[PDB]
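Q: Structure for this?
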Amino acid sequence: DIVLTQSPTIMSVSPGEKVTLTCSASSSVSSNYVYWYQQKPGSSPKVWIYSTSNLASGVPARFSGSGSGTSYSLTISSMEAEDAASYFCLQWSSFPYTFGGGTKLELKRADVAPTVSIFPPSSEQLTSGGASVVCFLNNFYPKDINVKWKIDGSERQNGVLNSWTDQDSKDSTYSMSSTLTLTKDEYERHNSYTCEATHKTSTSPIVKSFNRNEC
Amino acid sequence: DVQLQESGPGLVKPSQSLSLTCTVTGYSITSGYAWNWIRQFPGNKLEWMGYIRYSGDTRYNPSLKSRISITRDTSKNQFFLQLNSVTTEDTATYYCAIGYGNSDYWGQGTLVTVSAAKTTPPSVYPLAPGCGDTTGSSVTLGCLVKGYFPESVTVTWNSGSLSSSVHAFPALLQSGLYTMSSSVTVPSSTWPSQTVTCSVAHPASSTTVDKKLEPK
């Protein structure tokens, strides 16, 4: 029932830099029963460090652990693309066994502007009496980005479903999908739809739009 | 060469009972180790539920007592988890695992949703680009799957063929229903000549939809 507190909760690191994760216990625990796990998206956790400071099998030499008493910590010599993942610490020196919240580590990279695409509803969804306008914003960084929808130049914020991917393992970029769902009813009462994206890679908003007219 | 593999219902209604099965291969439940049941809540919070020792005795997390029961079948070489009176809080990805020292073994994991909401297949819609207005160096198609539940749908472009330049997005739950999408980018010459199809499968309702993206 020992509460394992981890920090930072999330952090961006530039390649080559040194980073040190922490795990604080509400009460002292045996250094022998403090493990560290690494979990990559869509994969299960894997043992990374056992007994506070022993590297597990397959773990690269740059990783290293240490700590004792009520403070334990994991350290990366020089960050790498693949070291981007979640890291949890575990203690099984007292029942019940408890994990820590985890620390996600994102890999900083060079800024990149999103490639935006817009899509009008399809015949099929229309037949169903519904209309969905979809906008994809691909391969960008940083992750912070704002997206506004404009119907006939007027800004609409209700009925917007946003979803992000994870930092890509190939280029460290992100991708977002924004979806606006309206009634076929409301879709025909307007003519222009615009997906307006505001990212750091520019002062002016990246915009894409179409008109029910021209089709 | 150890192999673990969870298996279960996928969707169960509140107050009902949960039964998961972990099949171990390449090693005996009796030879050694402690066999654990671990669950990950949406949000990634991890919880140790309990284990069964190779000796057959058990240990349970004090907050799951009275509802939990870990057992096994040495003849089948597999342990089980039984959680009764499940609430929505018990929704998560359930894993079985063992491990000591510089190693461990986990199962791929199994998602279990605890909801009264009814199973609903998906509506799959093609997402072609606007009429005359897309002819750069690369074109971008898409697929939109919506209205389905429970979670877990499988989407592939051209049955695995197309793998590079695709992005599937995490489903979203809006009013007891899931929406999910995926895009695929290819060079302008490829489409619409070469056929580009979007493959979609929803197990919880045994439905397989195939939608080829045709030009507007």
